Ligand binder design. Structure first.
Ligand SMILES: Nc1ncnc2c1ncn2[C@H]1C[C@H](O)[C@@H](COP(=O)(O)NP(=O)(O)OP(=O)(O)O)O1
Ligand SMILES: Nc1ncnc2c1ncn2[C@H]1C[C@H](O)[C@@H](CO)O1
Ligand SMILES: [Co+2]
Ligand SMILES: [Mg+2]
Ligand SMILES: [Mg+2]
Length: 422
DNA sequence: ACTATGACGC
DNA sequence: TGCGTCATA
């Protein structure tokens, strides 16, 4: 139960299964229980894929691959596309579905919304209460209909394995020690089973969850048994789980830092970090990242679940590749205006719904020839929620950046974001 | 030339 | 602070 072994909390991560697909299926019943996908608003090669149904994943379909190329592998494949507005994607439908789920989770515990379809939950308090109200009654497997215990058992049919693993887990749980970490996780999974049932009952959406002692393990556990299932990862299962867990699959190590770890230490798996001393890790990744790595490879992490439901920023952007790159003043003014209008639309609802106002406008662009996501970013005061004014304010700041008569090189990206709410 | 939000260091 | 860079859905 110690902080020392990082078994001090019960944390869960809930993520909706093929979220965009499910949102479309709720509107159109005919799309249910059939292989389908959702492509971006642009139609070329059938459109880029962002969300794929599980039925369709069986045929090998993935996101980030062309729709028509996906078609060949799964000809039965049904397609849904993001509605278009002001020349760009319209995600209102999904954002609205997102709100539904979040309000339901917030009823069971305060949450930390981490993305449009997932949120972390700190269930530590709720678990104590459940242990109080239970009054010593045992936990039957019937309260965990969709739970997988990572690492078990030791020694369609897949359902048989799940229950056997679940039974050995339950048969070895502490009965008298209410502060037993494993027992705490188990109760946390019970609460999550209820939470997920409510989400489905009230919205029809299905999802998965991970229950463990920290955000990193909870997030990792969540992807272990998808879809419509939840996974419990105990501290004792970590050595085994990490023995062959690719380093880049761990939260915050999917990019350069993670690549750097693989490269500098000559390892591929999380479990291999264990052989290094904390000082070796600090001398190579820094005091802070070194200590974090030292503890994380042992299943220990302390980032707290921070209650957040409201976005810290609201923004939108658009890319204009190749021929399309924005060269003239007319072009840049118009697209800035389209973006600012979407911004105004969202900021308005934001103010109507949450009584806060953005005081700052951030403008970001990318000039043709630049490999980076964004070439530069600037900001200015956001006094009025007026799209025309904001468009001109944004234009003035990008005009300042730097051929004094047109844009050379041209812009391949425009970005507007409202922040500094108060 | 295949499309959002959040955090960190300084 | 404001900004470049990094992380990830
Ligand atoms: N790179 C991207 N660009 C645009 N939209 C994206 C995106 N990544 C995800 N989305 C949109 C599309 C998604 O529907 C949604 C959720 O992202 P996930 O949770 O990553 N993926 P899903 O829910 O689909 O499947 P499951 O979790 O079961 O694996 O956000
Ligand atoms: N690579 C990383 N990804 C995410 N968070 C990290 C990373 N390295 C250090 N930290 C954090 C965690 C601690 O709470 C804190 C140490 O005081 O800093
Ligand atoms: Co004007
Ligand atoms: Mg998802
Ligand atoms: Mg997600």
């Amino acid at each position: 139960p110690h902080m020392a072994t990082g078994q001090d909390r019960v944390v869960a991560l809930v993520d909706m299964d093929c979220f965009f697909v499910q949102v479309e299926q709720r509107q159109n019943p005919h799309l249910r229980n059939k292989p389908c996908a959702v492509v971006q608003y642009k139609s070329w090669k059938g459109g880029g894929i962002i969300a794929v149904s599980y039925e369709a994943r069986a045929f090998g379909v993935t996101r980030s691959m062309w729709a028509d190329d996906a078609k060949k592998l799964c000809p039965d494949l049904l397609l849904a596309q993001v509605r278009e507005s002001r020349g760009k994607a319209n995600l209102t439908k999904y954002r609205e579905a997102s709100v539904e789920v979040m309000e339901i989770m917030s009823r069971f515990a305060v949450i930390e919304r981490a993305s449009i379809d997932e949120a972390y939950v700190d269930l530590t308090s709720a678990v104590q209460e459940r242990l109080q109200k239970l009054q010593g009654q045992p936990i039957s497997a019937d309260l965990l209909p969709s739970t997988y215990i990572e690492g078990l058992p030791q020694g369609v049919q897949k359902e048989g394995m799940r229950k056997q693993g679940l039974f050995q887990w339950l048969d070895s749980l502490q009965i008298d020690n209410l502060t037993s970490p494993d027992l705490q996780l188990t109760v946390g999974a019970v609460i999550v089973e209820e939470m997920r049932a409510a989400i489905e009952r009230e919205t029809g959406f299905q999802c998965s969850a991970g229950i463990s002692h920290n955000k990193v393990l909870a997030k990792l556990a969540c992807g272990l048994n998808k879809p419509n299932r939840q996974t419990l990862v105990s501290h004792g299962s970590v050595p085994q789980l990490f023995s062959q867990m690719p380093i880049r699959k761990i939260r915050s190590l999917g990019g350069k830092l993670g690549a750097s770890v693989i490269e500098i230490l000559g390892i591929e798996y999380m479990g291999e970090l264990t052989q290094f001393t904390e000082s070796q890790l600090q001398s190579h990744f820094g005091e802070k990242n070194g200590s974090w790595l030292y503890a994380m490879c042992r299943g220990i992490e302390h980032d707290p679940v921070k209650p957040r439901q409201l976005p810290k920023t609201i923004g939108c952007s658009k890319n204009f590749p190749g021929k399309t790159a924005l060269a003239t003043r007319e072009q840049v003014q118009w697209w800035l205006l389209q973006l600012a209008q979407e911004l105004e639309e969202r900021l308005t609802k934001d103010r109507n719904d949450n009584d806060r106002v953005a005081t700052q406008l951030v403008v970001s662009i990318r000039v043709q020839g630049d490999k980076r996501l964004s070439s530069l970013r600037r900001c200015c005061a956001l006094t009025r929620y007026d799209a025309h004014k904001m468009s001109h304010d944004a234009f003035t700041v990008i005009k300042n950046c730097n051929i004094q008569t047109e844009w050379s090189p041209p812009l391949t990206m425009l970005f507007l974001c409202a922040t500094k709410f108060s």
